[PDB]
């Protein structure tokens, strides 16, 4: 701790209209100090995503000035295999949530209202992960 390894300028992250772009390389580096991180999976060969492209961006801002503050980001499963397999992303668009390192599978109408409800709902410190877990990678 407190090493200070900066130079190659590798550890970075971009965004789009409020939509951050995370990758297996900056995945943890980002969620490192994050209580709740929204991860959105998509594919370049998936047209159905194009219609959501703008639908998502709008959400970002919403959860942006929300409380607690949440960081909305997306990931190209196609490009990110490790992450894709992590949340068993066998389809798209696939929305997921990260809680202190806990993958929370979403279920319901992926809408600006619904999507936010769950996310903003999970961000809460009281919120807790329900039983019947799907995957638990050395959670702890």
Swiss-Prot record:
The Thioredoxin domain, residue ranges: 8-124
Motif window: CXXC: 46-49
Name recorded for this polypeptide: Protein disulfide-isomerase A4
Subcellular location: Endoplasmic reticulum lumen; Melanosome
Transmembrane segments: none
Protein family per UniProt: Belongs to the protein disulfide isomerase family.
Subunit structure: Part of a large chaperone multiprotein complex comprising DNAJB11, HSP90B1, HSPA5, HYOU, PDIA2, PDIA4, PDIA6, PPIB, SDF2L1, UGGT1 and very small amounts of ERP29, but not, or at very low levels, CALR nor CANX. Component of a complex containing at least CRELD2, MANF, MATN3 and PDIA4.
Organism this protein belongs to: Mus musculus (Mouse)
Disulfide feature: 46-49
């Amino acid at each position: 701790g407190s090493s200070g390894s900066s130079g190659d300028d590798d550890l970075e992250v971009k965004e789009e209209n409020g939509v951050w772009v995370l990758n297996d390389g900056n995945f943890d580096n980002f969620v490192a100090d994050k209580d709740t991180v929204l991860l959105e999976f998509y594919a370049p060969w998936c047209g159905h995503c194009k219609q959501f492209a703008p639908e998502y961006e709008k959400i970002a801002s919403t959860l942006k000035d929300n409380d607690p503050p949440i960081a909305v980001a997306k990931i190209d499963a196609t490009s990110a295999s490790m992450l894709a397999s992590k949340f068993d992303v066998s389809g798209y668009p696939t929305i997921k949530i990260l809680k202190k390192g806990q993958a929370v599978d979403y279920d319901g109408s992926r809408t600006q209202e619904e999507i936010v409800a769950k996310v903003r709902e999970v961000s809460q410190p009281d919120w807790t992960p329900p039983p019947e877990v799907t995957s638990g990678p050395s959670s702890g």
